[PDB]
Amino acid sequence: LDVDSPAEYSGPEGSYFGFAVDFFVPSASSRMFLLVGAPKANTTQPGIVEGGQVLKCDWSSTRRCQPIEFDATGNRDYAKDDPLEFKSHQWFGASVRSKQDKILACAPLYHWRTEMKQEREVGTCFLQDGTKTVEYAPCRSQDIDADGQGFCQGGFSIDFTKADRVLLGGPGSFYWQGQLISDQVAEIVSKYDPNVYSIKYNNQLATRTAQAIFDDSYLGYSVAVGDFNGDGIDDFVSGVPRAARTLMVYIYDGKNMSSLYNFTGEQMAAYFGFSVAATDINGDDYADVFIGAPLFMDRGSDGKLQEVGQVSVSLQRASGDFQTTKLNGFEVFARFGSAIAPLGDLDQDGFNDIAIAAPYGGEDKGIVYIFNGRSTGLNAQILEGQWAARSMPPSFGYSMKGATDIDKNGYPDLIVGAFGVDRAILYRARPVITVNAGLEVYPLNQDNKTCSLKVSCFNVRFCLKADGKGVLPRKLNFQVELLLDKLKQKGAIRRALFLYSRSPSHSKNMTISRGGLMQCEELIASEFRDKLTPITIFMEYRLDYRTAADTTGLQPILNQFTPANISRQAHILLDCGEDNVCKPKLEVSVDSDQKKIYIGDDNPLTLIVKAQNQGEGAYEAELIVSIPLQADFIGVVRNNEALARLSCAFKTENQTRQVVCDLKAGTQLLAGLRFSVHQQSEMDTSKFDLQIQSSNLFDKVSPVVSHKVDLA
Amino acid sequence: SEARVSDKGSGDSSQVTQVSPQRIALRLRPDDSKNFSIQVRQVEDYPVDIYYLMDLSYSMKDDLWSIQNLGTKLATQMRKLTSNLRIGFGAFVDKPVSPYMYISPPEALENPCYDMKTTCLPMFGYKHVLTLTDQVTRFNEEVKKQSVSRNRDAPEGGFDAIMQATVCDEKIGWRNDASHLLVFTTDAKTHIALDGRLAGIVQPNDGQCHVGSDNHYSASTTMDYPSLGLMTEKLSQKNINLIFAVTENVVNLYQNYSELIPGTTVGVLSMDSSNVLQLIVDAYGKIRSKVELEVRDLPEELSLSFNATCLNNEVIPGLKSCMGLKIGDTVSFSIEAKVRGCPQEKEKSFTIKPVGFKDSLIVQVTFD
Ligand SMILES: CC(C)(C)c1cc(Br)cc([C@@H](CN(C(=O)CN)C(=O)c2cc(O)cc(Nc3ncc(O)cn3)c2)C(=O)O)c1
């Protein structure tokens, strides 16, 4: 989703604008409308206040939000001193749905002058059929009592069925048990007669009453539709948040109203069933079930309860092979769960996804989570309501709908409401781009010395490709970055370099087109003391998002997965390749030939040096002829009967004598090794060993030597 | 070098000294580090604040007696336990909004039982009639004079009564130094933090007090019921001992409710209200206090040292306090002085203040 440049809307103060959200479209036209409820708006209609509105806000180029076709049509009367409706206590705009040319806007707190008595109770819905507008009130049909559909609040939650049926949910349709009402659109509009206040439709399918055990369950609190038995007709899944001893979600057949599998939670008061979504994550057409528990609380990191919320993914598979998993929240009191918005292929690279929001998380303002779906699901983006509270918690994410595309996306775009601040924001989904790449090393060492002045020249691979589906700009300007050698300290050095530039790294600019064609570049890869450590090849890439956006300004995005940052190793001959495994056998030994030397600035004590390692890769073998304190290599031997150019370097860091001499077989590069032994401490008397520092000779076991000298 | 103490009595209602002889005199010189021991055995009762909460809705058709009886018994039960008791009450039925408050006929607003041929006072917000006062006789007289009202749906909003009770520090009462007990009585599956959508109420409950000038809860009609995790937060923050004193028909639900809110326990309301009286006594054994001493009026001299010969004959130098003292535990403090320099004074004195304790340790030194 996109958060940097969204589209936002607002309305009258205190109007609860954005409490309900959906998408209106025109029949085979691009003038799509982002329907959004304003249930608390003052009504600009005769003889009525406190009615609310459903505002049509266009998609682009304008922020105008205008009321529905039903406007300037006030309270109808019953007699000369009695209004037919007790409107001015309603919430018109609390639930909005649209399929192709239809509106289902409902006022769950609408009241009407009843016929049985003079009381007021029912919820009403105002459809639209092209120009004609009709009234829907399935809970108004002679069932005027709290025992039945009097307190129905019908239309609190509504949904659409592929058979062109409308699934209406009134949690109070029964004694707050709730009921699903499904009526065909053709039957509703055809049977319209305004003088009849309780129109009956013949093909109505609705859930009947239950026992007194079921009560206050709010069956119609949340609704969704899917196929859960495999007959091509959408079943009715419903959010019953307070069922099974307030621990539920019901599934009803589309054409039979029969009871399919029920889902229950293990936590209490978590409100398991506040929102329900029906989509596919695993891959098979058998639709999954999602249940929200925004008040879920479990044992935390400190061993104490914390309310973080939780959701449930039900991988409903045929023949009873059901699998379930639970996703936990992350921020305390954030009410993670709440609005679960079934998105669909928010990323086309795979199957559908789900948006779960936290209306009271983040700094100070609302939080939205995103869960991408992969095979078997179990995949357990972030959005914030940066709008600040005015006089009410800005419940960002409380209302959400992301099932419908509104652009040249394929991905479905997301609408978010912030009713507590009187506003609604459009989160447009972004075009996903997946990428793959790799590289390897082709080239022998001594033959590279003939590369030009002569240097060493090697080769590696430069292959990357993205391709990707969807409608987005054909050519994408990718930035790629590569490293010659990695795992180096800030002070470490390079070994392989680009001869044309000697740069230890290189980044490339490419405007690659979208396609399956493979595109790779071309490049060719005794002054360095480091041999043993392997050369590390590294690969990095990115995309100039700013110029890659379309005319609408929708920013492209690379794959949210596919972590990149990939790297591989390499090795070159003549470093230790002269040895097949480069395993050394040191036996590094020296001896103190001379003894009985007087103590104190006398003639230097003569020692001997010899080598014992037989490893084939005995490059850079070190001669650290360690000595005790108060000694130094005074009088470097010049005779050099078998000595080599080993000249030592001396230092006394942290009271450690360096005397580092240097050199492929155990050989007696021997000469008189002298030491000043200028001991000034008369109370002391008389530890000689060869320290290991050669990586080519380094091993987990270092056969060394240890000897002393006799002084008198 | 002399040092002579006087108050050997180990506490009394009249002899209110909760320490050893607490008046010590001594004659010293520079660097005359002297030693003496004190016993600070605490024999005083523990402080407590108790809040009584009722549903008192039309769900309490005849169950209002169980609430009224428990409040009086809870008052007299803890008076026996302790004489530092402060008690009060506050009531709540449900939110005054469309699907509950009976808004349609002009008759129902003053009486939502009109159609039942009986009267009931208009269903209200959280209105507590009594702040915590030591007057036990006023509490049971006022708490018994309240009646019930009617909401449409079976669940009741007594959860908001808990939240307001645990955030209104001064309107209803909370003492800093006392233990805090909150008993909440209900008989229905109470609304939980999200039932306000059906009522148009979409504001989460807050940790702020909203009683206001009038006793009625101002935000009862514009903010939702409290979250079960929010009640866990404010409860432990203010050291509230919550008791979901509910009925047997819903005890199992409220039992499982308590396992989610730590430190909470339930009790079946009945004529024999012992399900909760043996519970508040349990909380009495967990509110055991501590003993700590302080230094005051010290003239920038006369260094003092303490040894913690505290419970179960444990000795640890440097420490000056031991926790978890029941009534009657005799913690001793061997105190050693350290005088430095030569003040330009002949007679000086300064006091040791046992924190939270009425009495104090005073030492007078005559020196030159
Ligand atoms: C007076 C008292 C103490 C009774 C009371 C106080 C408050 Br304040 C609120 C109420 C409500 C809730 N309620 C109750 O309190 C009792 N459970 C019921 O609503 C109720 C009753 C049944 O006898 C069956 C069912 N179940 C049911 N629902 C719909 C349907 O079509 C068939 N059955 C539901 C009411 O009865 O109107 C009552």
PDB file of C-alpha atoms in Angstrom, chain A residues 124-275:
ATOM      1  CA  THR A 124     -33.803   0.710   6.930  1.00  0.00           C
ATOM      2  CA  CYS A 125     -31.844   0.446   3.702  1.00  0.00           C
ATOM      3  CA  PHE A 126     -32.228   2.606   0.595  1.00  0.00           C
ATOM      4  CA  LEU A 127     -31.237   0.824  -2.594  1.00  0.00           C
ATOM      5  CA  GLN A 128     -30.568   2.518  -5.907  1.00  0.00           C
ATOM      6  CA  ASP A 129     -31.521   1.052  -9.290  1.00  0.00           C
ATOM      7  CA  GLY A 130     -30.254   3.459 -11.925  1.00  0.00           C
ATOM      8  CA  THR A 131     -32.577   6.408 -11.380  1.00  0.00           C
ATOM      9  CA  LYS A 132     -35.118   4.650  -9.151  1.00  0.00           C
ATOM     10  CA  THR A 133     -34.557   4.475  -5.399  1.00  0.00           C
ATOM     11  CA  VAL A 134     -36.402   2.007  -3.169  1.00  0.00           C
ATOM     12  CA  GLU A 135     -36.620   1.243   0.544  1.00  0.00           C
ATOM     13  CA  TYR A 136     -35.538  -1.995   2.220  1.00  0.00           C
ATOM     14  CA  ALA A 137     -36.557  -2.870   5.789  1.00  0.00           C
ATOM     15  CA  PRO A 138     -36.690  -6.648   6.244  1.00  0.00           C
ATOM     16  CA  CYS A 139     -37.160  -6.235  10.002  1.00  0.00           C
ATOM     17  CA  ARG A 140     -40.304  -4.107   9.523  1.00  0.00           C
ATOM     18  CA  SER A 141     -42.636  -6.903   8.333  1.00  0.00           C
ATOM     19  CA  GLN A 142     -45.224  -7.156  11.141  1.00  0.00           C
ATOM     20  CA  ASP A 143     -42.474  -8.363  13.505  1.00  0.00           C
ATOM     21  CA  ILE A 144     -42.765  -5.193  15.584  1.00  0.00           C
ATOM     22  CA  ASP A 145     -41.564  -6.351  19.005  1.00  0.00           C
ATOM     23  CA  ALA A 146     -38.335  -6.682  20.947  1.00  0.00           C
ATOM     24  CA  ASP A 147     -39.090 -10.419  20.912  1.00  0.00           C
ATOM     25  CA  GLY A 148     -38.591 -10.270  17.150  1.00  0.00           C
ATOM     26  CA  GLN A 149     -37.251  -7.817  14.582  1.00  0.00           C
ATOM     27  CA  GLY A 150     -38.367  -4.627  16.345  1.00  0.00           C
ATOM     28  CA  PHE A 151     -34.862  -3.713  17.534  1.00  0.00           C
ATOM     29  CA  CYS A 152     -33.337  -5.259  14.435  1.00  0.00           C
ATOM     30  CA  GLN A 153     -30.859  -2.509  13.519  1.00  0.00           C
ATOM     31  CA  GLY A 154     -30.966  -4.189  10.122  1.00  0.00           C
ATOM     32  CA  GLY A 155     -28.193  -3.218   7.781  1.00  0.00           C
ATOM     33  CA  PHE A 156     -25.617  -2.874  10.550  1.00  0.00           C
ATOM     34  CA  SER A 157     -23.491  -5.217   8.422  1.00  0.00           C
ATOM     35  CA  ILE A 158     -24.288  -6.062   4.797  1.00  0.00           C
ATOM     36  CA  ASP A 159     -22.733  -8.051   1.974  1.00  0.00           C
ATOM     37  CA  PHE A 160     -23.256  -9.111  -1.636  1.00  0.00           C
ATOM     38  CA  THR A 161     -23.746 -12.621  -3.021  1.00  0.00           C
ATOM     39  CA  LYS A 162     -22.685 -13.674  -6.520  1.00  0.00           C
ATOM     40  CA  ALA A 163     -26.299 -14.776  -7.085  1.00  0.00           C
ATOM     41  CA  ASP A 164     -27.078 -11.028  -6.824  1.00  0.00           C
ATOM     42  CA  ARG A 165     -28.456 -11.609  -3.319  1.00  0.00           C
ATOM     43  CA  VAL A 166     -27.790  -9.114  -0.529  1.00  0.00           C
ATOM     44  CA  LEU A 167     -26.771 -10.502   2.866  1.00  0.00           C
ATOM     45  CA  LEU A 168     -28.073  -8.103   5.515  1.00  0.00           C
ATOM     46  CA  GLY A 169     -26.990  -8.411   9.127  1.00  0.00           C
ATOM     47  CA  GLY A 170     -28.924  -7.079  12.080  1.00  0.00           C
ATOM     48  CA  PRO A 171     -27.371  -7.963  15.431  1.00  0.00           C
ATOM     49  CA  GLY A 172     -30.533  -6.853  17.217  1.00  0.00           C
ATOM     50  CA  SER A 173     -32.890  -8.583  14.775  1.00  0.00           C
ATOM     51  CA  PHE A 174     -33.647 -11.025  17.611  1.00  0.00           C
ATOM     52  CA  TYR A 175     -33.023 -10.491  21.292  1.00  0.00           C
ATOM     53  CA  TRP A 176     -29.570  -9.371  20.138  1.00  0.00           C
ATOM     54  CA  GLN A 177     -28.964 -12.898  18.900  1.00  0.00           C
ATOM     55  CA  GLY A 178     -28.688 -11.568  15.358  1.00  0.00           C
ATOM     56  CA  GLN A 179     -29.885 -12.761  11.968  1.00  0.00           C
ATOM     57  CA  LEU A 180     -28.696 -13.015   8.380  1.00  0.00           C
ATOM     58  CA  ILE A 181     -31.265 -11.848   5.821  1.00  0.00           C
ATOM     59  CA  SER A 182     -30.669 -12.597   2.138  1.00  0.00           C
ATOM     60  CA  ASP A 183     -33.016 -11.227  -0.523  1.00  0.00           C
ATOM     61  CA  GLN A 184     -32.663 -11.070  -4.282  1.00  0.00           C
ATOM     62  CA  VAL A 185     -32.100  -7.582  -5.652  1.00  0.00           C
ATOM     63  CA  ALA A 186     -34.701  -8.066  -8.389  1.00  0.00           C
ATOM     64  CA  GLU A 187     -37.356  -9.050  -5.848  1.00  0.00           C
ATOM     65  CA  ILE A 188     -36.630  -6.047  -3.610  1.00  0.00           C
ATOM     66  CA  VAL A 189     -36.857  -3.398  -6.334  1.00  0.00           C
ATOM     67  CA  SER A 190     -39.818  -5.020  -8.106  1.00  0.00           C
ATOM     68  CA  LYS A 191     -41.970  -5.195  -4.962  1.00  0.00           C
ATOM     69  CA  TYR A 192     -41.439  -1.495  -4.148  1.00  0.00           C
ATOM     70  CA  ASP A 193     -44.569   0.454  -3.185  1.00  0.00           C
ATOM     71  CA  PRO A 194     -44.110   3.457  -0.872  1.00  0.00           C
ATOM     72  CA  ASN A 195     -47.645   3.345   0.535  1.00  0.00           C
ATOM     73  CA  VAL A 196     -46.812  -0.167   1.809  1.00  0.00           C
ATOM     74  CA  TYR A 197     -44.542   0.086   4.845  1.00  0.00           C
ATOM     75  CA  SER A 198     -43.805  -3.630   5.357  1.00  0.00           C
ATOM     76  CA  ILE A 199     -43.165  -4.911   1.825  1.00  0.00           C
ATOM     77  CA  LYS A 200     -42.812  -8.697   1.729  1.00  0.00           C
ATOM     78  CA  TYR A 201     -40.488 -10.508  -0.684  1.00  0.00           C
ATOM     79  CA  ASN A 202     -41.279 -14.113  -1.560  1.00  0.00           C
ATOM     80  CA  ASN A 203     -37.770 -15.575  -1.931  1.00  0.00           C
ATOM     81  CA  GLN A 204     -36.476 -14.270   1.404  1.00  0.00           C
ATOM     82  CA  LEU A 205     -34.025 -16.600   3.155  1.00  0.00           C
ATOM     83  CA  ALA A 206     -33.303 -15.649   6.757  1.00  0.00           C
ATOM     84  CA  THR A 207     -31.972 -17.315   9.889  1.00  0.00           C
ATOM     85  CA  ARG A 208     -34.701 -18.369  12.325  1.00  0.00           C
ATOM     86  CA  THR A 209     -34.738 -17.927  16.114  1.00  0.00           C
ATOM     87  CA  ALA A 210     -32.651 -19.926  18.579  1.00  0.00           C
ATOM     88  CA  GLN A 211     -32.990 -20.914  22.220  1.00  0.00           C
ATOM     89  CA  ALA A 212     -32.573 -18.549  25.160  1.00  0.00           C
ATOM     90  CA  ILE A 213     -29.005 -19.832  25.589  1.00  0.00           C
ATOM     91  CA  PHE A 214     -28.092 -17.930  22.429  1.00  0.00           C
ATOM     92  CA  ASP A 215     -28.604 -14.263  23.287  1.00  0.00           C
ATOM     93  CA  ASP A 216     -26.680 -10.969  22.851  1.00  0.00           C
ATOM     94  CA  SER A 217     -24.462 -12.989  20.476  1.00  0.00           C
ATOM     95  CA  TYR A 218     -24.753 -10.352  17.705  1.00  0.00           C
ATOM     96  CA  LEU A 219     -24.921 -12.837  14.791  1.00  0.00           C
ATOM     97  CA  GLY A 220     -25.185 -10.040  12.227  1.00  0.00           C
ATOM     98  CA  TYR A 221     -22.341  -8.051  13.771  1.00  0.00           C
ATOM     99  CA  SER A 222     -20.038  -8.930  10.864  1.00  0.00           C
ATOM    100  CA  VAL A 223     -20.784 -10.785   7.637  1.00  0.00           C
ATOM    101  CA  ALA A 224     -18.895 -12.269   4.698  1.00  0.00           C
ATOM    102  CA  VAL A 225     -19.614 -14.684   1.856  1.00  0.00           C
ATOM    103  CA  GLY A 226     -17.762 -17.657   0.413  1.00  0.00           C
ATOM    104  CA  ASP A 227     -17.996 -21.256  -0.770  1.00  0.00           C
ATOM    105  CA  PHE A 228     -17.529 -23.694   2.117  1.00  0.00           C
ATOM    106  CA  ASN A 229     -19.114 -26.892   0.746  1.00  0.00           C
ATOM    107  CA  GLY A 230     -18.503 -26.743  -3.017  1.00  0.00           C
ATOM    108  CA  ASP A 231     -21.723 -26.172  -4.965  1.00  0.00           C
ATOM    109  CA  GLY A 232     -20.984 -22.864  -6.721  1.00  0.00           C
ATOM    110  CA  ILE A 233     -23.206 -20.711  -4.475  1.00  0.00           C
ATOM    111  CA  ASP A 234     -21.834 -18.320  -1.862  1.00  0.00           C
ATOM    112  CA  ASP A 235     -22.386 -19.483   1.703  1.00  0.00           C
ATOM    113  CA  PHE A 236     -22.985 -16.974   4.496  1.00  0.00           C
ATOM    114  CA  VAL A 237     -20.274 -16.668   7.153  1.00  0.00           C
ATOM    115  CA  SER A 238     -21.031 -14.411  10.083  1.00  0.00           C
ATOM    116  CA  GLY A 239     -19.276 -12.711  12.959  1.00  0.00           C
ATOM    117  CA  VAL A 240     -20.978 -13.730  16.256  1.00  0.00           C
ATOM    118  CA  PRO A 241     -18.568 -12.049  18.737  1.00  0.00           C
ATOM    119  CA  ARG A 242     -20.426 -12.951  21.960  1.00  0.00           C
ATOM    120  CA  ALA A 243     -21.287 -16.633  21.434  1.00  0.00           C
ATOM    121  CA  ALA A 244     -20.287 -19.817  23.264  1.00  0.00           C
ATOM    122  CA  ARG A 245     -20.043 -18.192  26.696  1.00  0.00           C
ATOM    123  CA  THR A 246     -18.497 -15.013  25.203  1.00  0.00           C
ATOM    124  CA  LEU A 247     -15.556 -17.154  24.005  1.00  0.00           C
ATOM    125  CA  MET A 248     -17.718 -17.562  17.607  1.00  0.00           C
ATOM    126  CA  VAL A 249     -18.280 -17.578  13.821  1.00  0.00           C
ATOM    127  CA  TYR A 250     -21.224 -19.194  12.030  1.00  0.00           C
ATOM    128  CA  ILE A 251     -21.357 -20.560   8.484  1.00  0.00           C
ATOM    129  CA  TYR A 252     -24.665 -20.886   6.634  1.00  0.00           C
ATOM    130  CA  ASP A 253     -25.381 -22.420   3.242  1.00  0.00           C
ATOM    131  CA  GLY A 254     -26.293 -19.913   0.562  1.00  0.00           C
ATOM    132  CA  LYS A 255     -29.488 -21.529  -0.724  1.00  0.00           C
ATOM    133  CA  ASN A 256     -30.437 -23.869   2.144  1.00  0.00           C
ATOM    134  CA  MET A 257     -29.600 -21.644   5.152  1.00  0.00           C
ATOM    135  CA  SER A 258     -28.294 -24.861   6.720  1.00  0.00           C
ATOM    136  CA  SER A 259     -25.645 -24.803   9.441  1.00  0.00           C
ATOM    137  CA  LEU A 260     -22.123 -25.673   8.304  1.00  0.00           C
ATOM    138  CA  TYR A 261     -19.019 -25.713  10.525  1.00  0.00           C
ATOM    139  CA  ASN A 262     -18.765 -23.266  13.427  1.00  0.00           C
ATOM    140  CA  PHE A 263     -15.526 -21.697  14.666  1.00  0.00           C
ATOM    141  CA  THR A 264     -14.730 -20.885  18.297  1.00  0.00           C
ATOM    142  CA  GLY A 265     -11.873 -19.283  20.202  1.00  0.00           C
ATOM    143  CA  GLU A 266     -10.085 -20.208  23.406  1.00  0.00           C
ATOM    144  CA  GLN A 267      -9.743 -16.740  24.948  1.00  0.00           C
ATOM    145  CA  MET A 268     -12.556 -14.850  26.692  1.00  0.00           C
ATOM    146  CA  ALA A 269     -13.883 -11.326  26.087  1.00  0.00           C
ATOM    147  CA  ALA A 270     -11.458 -11.097  23.156  1.00  0.00           C
ATOM    148  CA  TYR A 271     -14.532 -10.299  20.989  1.00  0.00           C
ATOM    149  CA  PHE A 272     -13.606 -13.271  18.717  1.00  0.00           C
ATOM    150  CA  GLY A 273     -15.825 -12.400  15.719  1.00  0.00           C
ATOM    151  CA  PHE A 274     -15.721  -8.602  15.527  1.00  0.00           C
ATOM    152  CA  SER A 275     -14.810  -8.857  11.838  1.00  0.00           C
TER     153      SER A 275
END
